Structures are given as structure tokens and as C-alpha cells.
């Protein structure tokens, strides 16, 4: 189960 | 920012002449992920050598396990060929099978 | 203890490769590669193959979504550090659970790297961020304004941990069954008055092992050359520790292996 949100710089 | 890979050439199980085994090449601790790795048999590049999916450790350094199935013999010499952006020339590491 | 961890890699190609892998302890179970015909999240362990297509469509959803942000992020990092567009650059993502005694979250992780250096990381309190430079402070300000750390708390102490417990039960026959090390000692001379005692450990899972060469019972912490725990290729691992000893003094040195697969720490003697 991966992180449902998003990583954005 | 850039790190050189540690090369390890070894067999899955203890190597006995005539008994089927797997030749492994463990590159690890390098950055970036772009790396060239070949398994050698008598200096000849081995056809169809596979590797694991690219992953990294706690310090962001990548590692890969290049492997192929082989049968050791008394007179056949095996090695790994590794080229990286940190290495000036490709590095050939021989297989010391009685370590 | 137990742990789930994801490892994302994004490399920029001038004119972006996106690879993501997931681990439960030292066992990989999922993979996503952008360099595929129809890229999808694929199982690398048997205990995730029994998940429904609904789970894999959901997993592939975030992968394809995160690869899009990794395209945007790598381009934003270019302007942050004012680097040219002719070079290749790497952006990694490391997040996951750490399971504790009861079954609750022990430690939570959410780390970002840029070109092998730390970029920004979620602090252990799961409320604050640690930016490594002024460029990451832009990302930090971006995340505090959106309350991103709020989202990670709900994941790490929630969805993260619950699914780590779920994998450890659906794959309890392999993830929770430890394999003991098959150990042996070799002896090679390096001088006419010196030798190298090498203590081997093969075919053990998990990868957590500590090999120690002790002289007269006391730990020879230094003088003990040690190598990285390497994978054997079948899910188990290998490792060796060596010590250079004077010839005729080898009967003074003992190797000591402790692993979860061993009922008791065993003592070797070449």
C-alpha cells in the first residue's frame, strides 16, 4: 500500500 | 554527490565443479543509478544476464544484483565487468571461489 | 521488529525514468517501471499476488500519478538550483513504516533526495520538516501551507502500519519464518607469520546479522574487516567477517553469530 497522496517539490 | 560501487562476485551456493549454481555480481553503494555490469566467462560477456529491480539504501546509494545460472568447472574462469561514471575505466573483478 | 519501505527513483533524461519498489522487511513485493509497454504495478512476492485487481489498479494509479509529479519536481529542482537542462539529475523518495512491539507505528519516514544529497525529510514527530538547503525551504513552505505533514501522519500511523500487519499475516509462512545461517570458518595466510580468519554466514533471512571476531572473548571491533550483507538471489543473504591474526595465534580467536533463526548464539573455531 503506497502513499495515496503526492510528493511535489 | 557521486559514489563508486562496491563489486562482489560470488555464487549462490558453495561452488562445486559440475554442480549447477548461480553466478552473482553485487554492485552496491553507488550514485547515480546509471551503471554497466556484465558477467564474464573466460573474458567473454555472458549472454542473457539478469538483474534485480533498482533500489537504494538509507544513504540513497543504489544496489543491484546481476545474476546468471552457470556450472563451475576446474578450468573455466569467471569474473564481473563493471563500468560507472565514477570509474575511469571498467573494473574487472575475478571470482575467488575458495574465500 | 518489522518494517515496510518504498524506494522511488526518478532520473531526468535530457530530450524521465521512474522506478519504484516496495519492501516488507528484506523481501521485495512490488515494482513499477516507467520503461515498459503498458506500465503497471507488478507483484514481486507471492503474498501480494492474491490481492484483487482493485488493489493493483489502485496501486498503479498512485505510481503513474507520482511519476507525473516526479516529472514536474525534477523540472522545478532545475530552476531551484539554477542548473542547466543538459545534465541528468536524480530525485529519490524513501518512505515507510517501522513496526513496534504492540503493533503500532514505531517510526515514520518520508525522505527526499536530490543528486545523492538530502533534500527534505519529514521529522520523527510527523509534524515538522527538515530542509537541507535554501532550495528545499521552498518545498517546505509549499508543504506547510498545504498541511502535507497532516496527510503523512494519517498514512504512517494509519494505512501504512495497517497494511504492514496485513502483509505479515498474508505472507506469515515466509515473512515471519526466519532461516538460520549456515556458518563456517576459512583460514588463509597473508604472511609467513600472519593469517586471515574469515567467518562465513550463508542462506539466512532476514538480513539482520552481526558477525564478530573476538580474541580471548573480547570483541575485536576494529581490525575486523566486514562486508555488506549481500543477497544470495533466492531471498536469503550472505556475509563474512575477516580478521588478520598472527600465525600460531589462531586458536585464540572465536567467531560469534547472532541471528533470529538461531536458538542461541553459536561459537565458531577454525
CA proximity to C233, closest of B82, B5, B70, B60: B70
- Is C116's CB within 8 Å of B32's CB? yes
Q: Which method, experimentally, gave rise to this model?
A: X-ray
The answer on C114 and C229 residing in a single domain is no
Q: Which chain C residue's Cα is nearest to B6? A: C228
The answer on C168 and C71 residing in a single domain is yes
Which residues, at least 6 apart from C194, have a Cβ–Cβ distance to it below 8 Å? Answer: C244, C245, C246, C247
Neighbour-count burial of C128, counting CB atoms closer than 10 A to its CB (0-12 exposed, 13-18 middle, 19+ buried): exposed
The answer on C214 and C141 residing in a single domain is no
Final resolution, Å: 3.0
How far is it, in rounded angstroms, from Cα C245 to Cα C64?
Answer: 55
C82 to chain B, minimum CA–CA distance in Å?
17
Helices C134-146 and C53-80, packing angle to 10 deg: 130
Task: Choose among A2, A6, A9: nearest Cβ to C59.
Answer: A2
Please state whether at least 3 CB pairs lie below 8 Å between chains A and B: no
- Is A1's CB within 8 Å of C159's CB? yes
- Is A4's CB within 8 Å of C59's CB? no
The answer on C64 and C143 residing in a single domain is yes
Q: How many CB atoms lie within 10 A of CB B3?
A: 17
Report CA-CA distances (Å) from C57 to C60, C62, C91, C162.
5, 9, 25, 20
A2 to chain C, minimum CA–CA distance in Å?
7
Task: Choose among C28, C233, C238: nearest Cβ to B67.
Answer: C233
Residue C204 has which C-alpha cell? 539466512
Residues in chain C with CB shorter than 8 Å from the CB of A3 are 6, 62, 95, 110, 152, 155, 160
How far is it, in rounded angstroms, from Cα C1 to Cα C118?
Answer: 26
Q: Residue C225: which domain range?
A: 182-268
C233 to chain A, minimum CA–CA distance in Å?
25
C interface toward B at CB cutoff 8 Å? 7, 9, 11, 19, 21, 23, 28, 31, 33, 44, 88, 90, 92, 94, 113, 115-118, 186, 198, 202, 227-228, 230-234, 238, 240
Q: Structurally, how many domains does chain C consist of? A: 2
Residues in chain C with CB shorter than 8 Å from the CB of B55 are 7, 21, 23, 28
How far is it, in rounded angstroms, from Cα C178 to Cα C91?
Answer: 34
Q: Which chain C residue's Cα is nearest to B9? A: C230
For residue C22, give the CATH number of its domain.
3.30.500.10
How far is it, in rounded angstroms, from Cα C233 to Cα C230?
Answer: 9
For residue C204, give the CATH number of its domain.
2.60.40.10
Beta-carbon pairs below 8 A across chains A and C: 54
Residue C165 has which C-alpha cell? 500487519
Beta strands, E only, C2-161: 4-11, 17-24, 27-33, 42-43, 90-96, 109-114, 117-122, 129-131
Task: Choose among B8, B29, B56: nearest Cβ to C9.
Answer: B56
3 state DSSP class of B84: strand
Contact of B23 with B9, CB cutoff 8 Å: yes
Instruction: Name the residue ranges covered by the structural domains of chain B.
Output: 6-94
Domain boundary among C175, C201, C231: C175
Helices (H), C216-262: none
Report CA-CA distances (Å) from B24 to B79, B80, B98, C25, C203.
10, 9, 15, 22, 14
The answer on C200 and C168 residing in a single domain is no
The answer on C223 and C94 residing in a single domain is no
Residues in chain C with CB shorter than 8 Å from the CB of A8 are 69, 72-73, 76, 139, 142
Q: Which chain B residue's Cα is nearest to C238? A: B12
3.30.1330.10, 2.60.40.1930, 3.30.70.270, 2.60.40.10: CATH of B6-94: 2.60.40.10
The answer on C202 and C170 residing in a single domain is no
CA proximity to C201, closest of C236, C253, C175, C176: C236
Neighbours, chain B (3 or more CB pairs < 8 A): C
Q: Does C65 touch chain A (CB under 8 A)?
A: yes
Give contacts of C 122-161 with A, CB under 8 A.
136, 138-139, 142, 148, 151-152, 155, 159-160
Amino acid at each position: 500500500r503506497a502513499f495515496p497522496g503526492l510528493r511535489y517539490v | 554527490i557521486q559514489r563508486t560501487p562496491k563489486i562482489q562476485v560470488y555464487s549462490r551456493h558453495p561452488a562445486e565443479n559440475g554442480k549447477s549454481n548461480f553466478l552473482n555480481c553485487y554492485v552496491s553503494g553507488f550514485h547515480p543509478s546509471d551503471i554497466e555490469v556484465d558477467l564474464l566467462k573466460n573474458g567473454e560477456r555472458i549472454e542473457k544476464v539478469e538483474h534485480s529491480d533498482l533500489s537504494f539504501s538509507g544513504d540513497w546509494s543504489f544496489y543491484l544484483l546481476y545474476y546468471t545460472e552457470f556450472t563451475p568447472t576446474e578450468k573455466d574462469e569467471y569474473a564481473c565487468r563493471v563500468n560507472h561514471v565514477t570509474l575511469s575505466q571498467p573494473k574487472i573483478v575475478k571470482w575467488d571461489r575458495d574465500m | 521488529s518489522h518494517s515496510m519501505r518504498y524506494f522511488y527513483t526518478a532520473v531526468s533524461r535530457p530530450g524521465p525514468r521512474f522506478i519504484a519498489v516496495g519492501y516488507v522487511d528484506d523481501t521485495q513485493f512490488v515494482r513499477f517501471d516507467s520503461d515498459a509497454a503498458s506500465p503497471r504495478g507488478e507483484p514481486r512476492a507471492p503474498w501480494v499476488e492474491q490481492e484483487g485487481p482493485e488493489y493493483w489498479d489502485r496501486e498503479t494509479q498512485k505510481y503513474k500519478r507520482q511519476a507525473q509529479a516526479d516529472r514536474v519536481s525534477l523540472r522545478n529542482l532545475r530552476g531551484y538550483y539554477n542548473q542547466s537542462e543538459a545534465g541528468s539529475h536524480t530525485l529519490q523518495w524513501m518512505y515507510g513504516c517501522d513496526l513496534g512491539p504492540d503493533g503500532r507505528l514505531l517510526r515514520g519516514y518520508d525522505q527526499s533526495a536530490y543528486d545523492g544529497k538530502d533534500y527534505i525529510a519529514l521529522n520523527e514527530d510527523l509534524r515538522s520538516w527538515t530542509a537541507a538547503d535554501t532550495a528545499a525551504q521552498i518545498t517546505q513552505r509549499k508543504w506547510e501551507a498545504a498541511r502535507e505533514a497532516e496527510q503523512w501522519r494519517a498514512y504512517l500511523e494509519g494505512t501504512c502500519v495497517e497494511w504492514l500487519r496485513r502483509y505479515l499475516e498474508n505472507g506469515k509462512e515466509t515473512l515471519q519464518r526466519a532461516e538460520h545461517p549456515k556458518t563456517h570458518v576459512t583460514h588463509h595466510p597473508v604472511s609467513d607469520h600472519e593469517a586471515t580468519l574469515r567467518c562465513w554466514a550463508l542462506g539466512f533471512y532476514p538480513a539482520e546479522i552481526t558477525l564478530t571476531w573476538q580474541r580471548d572473548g573480547e570483541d575485536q571491533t576494529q581490525d575486523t574487516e566486514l562486508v555488506e550483507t549481500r543477497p544470495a538471489g533466492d531471498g536469503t543473504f550472505q556475509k563474512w567477517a575477516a580478521v588478520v591474526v598472527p600465525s600460531g595465534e589462531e586458536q585464540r580467536y572465536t567467531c560469534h553469530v547472532q541471528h533470529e533463526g538461531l536458538p542461541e548464539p553459536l561459537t565458531l573455531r577454525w
